[PDB]
Amino acid sequence: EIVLTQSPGTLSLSPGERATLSCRASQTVSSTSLAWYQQKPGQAPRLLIYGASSRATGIPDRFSGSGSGTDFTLTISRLEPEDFAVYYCQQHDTSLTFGGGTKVEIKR
Amino acid sequence: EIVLTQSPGTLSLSPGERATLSCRASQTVSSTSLAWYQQKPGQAPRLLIYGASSRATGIPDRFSGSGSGTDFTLTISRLEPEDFAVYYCQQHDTSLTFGGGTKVE
Amino acid sequence: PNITNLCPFDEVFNATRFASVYAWNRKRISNCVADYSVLYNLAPFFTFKCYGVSPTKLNDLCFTNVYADSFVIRGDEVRQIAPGQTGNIADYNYKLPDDFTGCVIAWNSNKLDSKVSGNYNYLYRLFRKSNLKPFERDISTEIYQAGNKPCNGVAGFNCYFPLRSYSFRPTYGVGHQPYRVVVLSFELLHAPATVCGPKK
Amino acid sequence: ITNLCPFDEVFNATRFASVYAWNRKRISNCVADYSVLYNLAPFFTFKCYGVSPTKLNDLCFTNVYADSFVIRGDEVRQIAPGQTGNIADYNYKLPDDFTGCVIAWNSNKLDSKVSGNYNYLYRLFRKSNLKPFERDISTEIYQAGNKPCNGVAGFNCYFPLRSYSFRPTYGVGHQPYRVVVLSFE
Amino acid sequence: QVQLVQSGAEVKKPGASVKVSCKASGYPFTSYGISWVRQAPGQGLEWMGWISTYNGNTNYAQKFQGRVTMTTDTSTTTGYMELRRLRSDDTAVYYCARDYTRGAWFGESLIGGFDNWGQGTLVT
Amino acid sequence: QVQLVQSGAEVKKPGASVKVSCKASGYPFTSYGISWVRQAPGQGLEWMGWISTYNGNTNYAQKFQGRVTMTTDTSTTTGYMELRRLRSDDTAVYYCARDYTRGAWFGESLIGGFDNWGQGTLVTVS
Ligand SMILES: *[C@@H]1O[C@H](CO[C@@H]2O[C@@H](C)[C@@H](O)[C@@H](O)[C@@H]2O)[C@@H](O[C@@H]2O[C@H](CO)[C@@H](O)[C@H](O)[C@H]2NC(C)=O)[C@H](O)[C@H]1NC(C)=O
Ligand SMILES: *[C@@H]1O[C@H](CO[C@@H]2O[C@@H](C)[C@@H](O)[C@@H](O)[C@@H]2O)[C@@H](O[C@@H]2O[C@H](CO)[C@@H](O)[C@H](O)[C@H]2NC(C)=O)[C@H](O)[C@H]1NC(C)=O
């Protein structure tokens, strides 16, 4: 099946800077079948972006994403202290799988 | 105004076969507003066909007409000594205009 | 009463142009002797079925005023021109009261009002907020907002144009063919008789 | 209430079928709420024939049909009753007794490939025109002349199907467009 | 049967005005209008105008708009035609015809034509 | 609103079985599906399968090809996941989510993803 990959595993940036998360795919994946999630500590994950471009209901405008074919990327315009969590990238082009995950924490 | 042209200006035909006349309209004329007339020499015109298909009162069954839009045709099944005169075509879709007139000998 | 003029029923039946259903023409006929015998003598293709009064007895009555209405509609919609009916034409274009005391006439007009390329000169109304009162005309073109977002007089999804076309062609069947309808209404009460009927 | 009709399973699908392979779906025994398309995708063209568009949530029918396909940008006009053309005559013909609606919208961001997408094909040469609601999933050697060929393409022997090769840089009339047609019975 | 009889010939000198009459018999006068058609010697017909016998409305041709006036009287059932400022090129035969091309009471077009003509009047 | 509620935690032991319940309210039940995803403490997420609430058609993963089965009850608006042959390697939190990735009536894919998630049920096997 399509094996997914994210890098880097851990990011240490400033609370207020502009960050970027990367997701890498093995085979080609239809852009209509890729999404992203956020897992705040002590909770359950929630949907952020679906279709690699559309923003989910109740998601701030500061979130956005773009990419197609093999490399997909989620960009955050600004970092905020409610945004420190682990994020995942999904595909359901053939069967379904989840990424390894990427963590972003405070730089100091 | 709508201008009607009749060709030919004269028809020389043998006494007993079928004739055909033409009245072509520059613009589009409704089938509701076309009629034909006959004028024997030294007499007054009389009505033959109204509505481009219907027949007037007292006209035999040998006179018939058809056509729509731009082309209209008047046909006679067979001729008699009383059917050699000048024929005219009328329209009143816009204002009222007559035709040039076709003679039959 | 002694009146000499004759009623112009040939002026409303043998006419050239008939109005659309949404702007139907209404005429007033008064002060004349009415001879309805010319209507029955026609070939048995006129649908002369009418209410409140028998056709044969029309020649011996006097009427205050006679109104004639004419329009062109679809072949299968002639059923809708009757008291106590519902439909697209009955609820948006033409309405007949429950008490009518008149006559309704309809005949085929395929040879005259239909074109091979298609006739789009006849119109009918598809959208209206509420049903119309008896004997009412609504000649008004304007965008209709079905939804809630407003539009500044522009076409849209929830913003509609209320008039459609019939698209008559000689290739359809009898149900889609154009028919011409003439509806006669009579008023009886005071009777300073204007329409008298032939009687010496 | 319960048992809402699956109109979101046909407008938000991932893969849309080709024109010659237009899928057909059966909808029955469900409450139909036509408010889903009353506010969505503010670029779509809604036209309905045979019934008043703003009376849909007032009528009870027997069965409801739904067919979907992807056509060219400038060919959306041909999908209508009493209209002819390459698509209308040869791929999908809507009869005069339509009593249904037609929906189309732009699909650039999902059906465009940088190198060109060849997943969508259409039939340009058929032996004869098709009846309303007729499908022909069959490709065979198309002979235009008089000399038959033994299943080999070439002169007077043309493959009846042609691709589209959609690209992001084409025009508005050349961009792929997704169309769904509802037929009421 | 329907018959229309006109007046006699005139030799009116150039510059004057002429009047032609047309008396009807055999049909209800009010229900139909009266039209006028003229024919020059050796040429075709031409339409002059239209007059309604119920309300007096008229519809003249554009060529003779400000020159011709028509008048009808119900008592004698006779129509009249006045042509003013005569010209040398007006020598023709004028005709009186019963009109079914335009309505009398309402003035709308109909299906038909000039169905009853008169004998004709020669004017020079 | 949309809310998902599950059952409590379990301390099941090897060789046993466990049942997970998922109750939802706020949407037409015969319109959407239900999908299950599990996550070990400290690792990433992991998929199990899909169930249709309309006709019972189901699809399952490969590593859980025969170890799992799921059922739905329309009246009570609840779905159940059965996992058997439990092992110490299945110590994870099991999640119930409303699925908008495959259609309930026709079985075709859709554009979207897991849009609503429950509190989470913790199960430890030892
Ligand atoms: C509509 O007109 C027809 C025919 O009109 C004839 O032609 C006109 C130019 C004019 O000269 C009319 O007087 C002609 O009658 C009418 O049908 C005729 O009706 C009369 C009266 O009964 C009858 O004697 C004729 O035979 C009929 N001819 C045909 C061909 O039907 C008809 O009556 C008119 N419509 C109405 C409502 O009166
Ligand atoms: C096609 O999907 C869009 C978006 O669906 C949203 O995301 C999904 C993952 C799922 O969670 C849905 O429930 C979400 O609504 C639908 O657009 C939404 O429609 C609703 C109802 O009209 C509206 O309240 C939302 O604001 C819309 N959201 C957006 C981003 O437009 C759309 O309705 C679906 N298509 C059909 C035919 O229903």
End-to-end CA distance of chain F: 38
Rounded to whole angstroms, how far apart are CA atoms A94 and B9?
83
Rounded to whole angstroms, how far apart are CA atoms A19 and F90?
35
The backbone torsions φ and ψ at residue A83, rounded to the nearest 5 degrees and listed phi first, read -110, 15
The backbone torsions φ and ψ at residue D56, rounded to the nearest 5 degrees and listed phi first, read -65, -40
How much distance in Å is there from the Cα of D98 to the middle of ligand 1?
42
In Å, how far are A106, B102, C72, D37, F55 from D32, measured between CA atoms? 51, 69, 36, 11, 19
Neighbours of B, requiring at least 3 CB pairs below 8 Å, are C, E
Neighbours of C, requiring at least 3 CB pairs below 8 Å, are B, D, E
Do residue C161 and residue C174 come from a single domain?
no
State which H helix or E strand residue D68 sits in: strand D64-71
Do residue D93 and residue D83 come from a single domain?
yes
* Residue D4 in contact with partner chain F when CB distance is under 8 A: yes
CA distance, residue D57 to nearest chain C CA (Å): 13
Do residue D63 and residue D105 come from a single domain?
yes
For residues E112 and C33, the answer to whether their CB atoms sit within 8 Å is: no
Burial class (CB within 10 angstroms; exposed 0-12, middle 13-18, buried 19+) of F48: buried
Rounded to whole angstroms, how far apart are CA atoms C34 and C194?
10
Give the three-class secondary structure for E47. Answer: strand
* DSSP state, residue D11: H
* Residue D125 in contact with partner chain C when CB distance is under 8 A: no
State which H helix or E strand residue C9 sits in: none
- Experimental approach was cryo-EM
Resolution stated for this PDB structure, in Å: 2.7
Query: Locate tokens 């096997």: which residue?
Result: F125
Rounded to whole angstroms, how far apart are CA atoms B2 and B99?
10
Characterize the bridge pairing of strands D100-106 and D177-184.
Answer: antiparallel
User: How many structural domains are present in chain C?
Assistant: 2
Domain locations in chain E? 3-123
- Angle at CA C120, nearest 5°, toward C119 and C123? 125
Rounded to whole angstroms, how far apart are CA atoms D22 and D99?
19
The structure tokens listed for C64 are 């205050």
Q: Which residues contact C40 (CB under 8 A, 6 or more apart)?
A: C48, C55
What secondary structure, in 3-state letters, does E65-98 show?
Answer: CCCEEEEEECCCCEEEEEECCCCHHHCEEEEEEE
Rounded to whole angstroms, how far apart are CA atoms C46 and F70?
71
Rounded to whole angstroms, how far apart are CA atoms A104 and A10?
6
The structure tokens listed for C48 are 């002369």
Question: Which range marks the domain in which residue C46 is found?
Answer: 1-117+170-200
Rounded to whole angstroms, how far apart are CA atoms F30 and F51?
11
Q: Where are the beta strands (DSSP E) in chain B?
A: 4-5, 10-11, 19-29, 34-39, 46-50, 54-55, 63-76, 86-91, 102-104
Using alpha carbons, select from E66, E61, E47, E59 the residue that is nearest to residue E114.
Answer: E47
What secondary structure, in 3-state letters, does C47-80 show?
Answer: CCEECCCCCHHHHHCCECEEEEEEEEEEHHHHHH
- Could you say which ligand is closest to the alpha carbon of residue C35? 1
Rounded to whole angstroms, how far apart are CA atoms E101 and E99?
6
Rounded to whole angstroms, how far apart are CA atoms A28 and D50?
44
Do residue C52 and residue C139 come from a single domain?
no
Domains of chain B: 4-104 (2.60.40.10)
Residues in C closer than 8 angstroms to D105, CB to CB, are none
What residue type is assigned to position A71 of the chain?
D
- Angle at CA C45, nearest 5°, toward C41 and C51? 80
From the CA atom positions of chain D, what is the Rg in Å?
Answer: 18
Do residue C72 and residue C133 come from a single domain?
no
Ligand 2 neighbours, Cβ below 6 Å, are A 50, 57; D 7-8, 11-12, 36, 40; F 100, 112, 115
In Å, how far are A40, B16, E26, E43 from B74, measured between CA atoms? 92, 16, 31, 21
What's the CATH code, domain F3-123? 2.60.40.10
Give the three-class secondary structure for A89. Answer: strand
Do residue D34 and residue D100 come from a single domain?
yes
Do residue D34 and residue D76 come from a single domain?
yes
CA distance, residue C54 to nearest chain E CA (Å): 27
Q: Whose CA is nearest to atom 33 of ligand 2?
A: D36
Do residue D87 and residue D175 come from a single domain?
yes
Q: Which residues contact D87 (CB under 8 A, 6 or more apart)?
A: D19, D71, D72, D75, D78, D79, D122
Rounded to whole angstroms, how far apart are CA atoms B45 and B39?
5
Q: Which residues contact C168 (CB under 8 A, 6 or more apart)?
A: C113, C114, C115, C118, C119, C122, C176, C177, C178
* Residue F75 in contact with partner chain D when CB distance is under 8 A: no
Give the three-class secondary structure for C10. Answer: helix
Q: Give the chain B residue nearest E118 (alpha carbons).
A: B44
In this structure, chain F runs to a length of 126
State which H helix or E strand residue A73 sits in: strand A71-76
What is the per-residue burial (b if ≥16 Cβ within 10 Å, else e) of B50-64? bbbeebbeeeeeebe
For residues D18 and D121, the answer to whether their CB atoms sit within 8 Å is: yes
Do residue D123 and residue D50 come from a single domain?
no
Q: Where are the beta strands (DSSP E) in C89-151?
A: 102-108, 123-125, 144-145
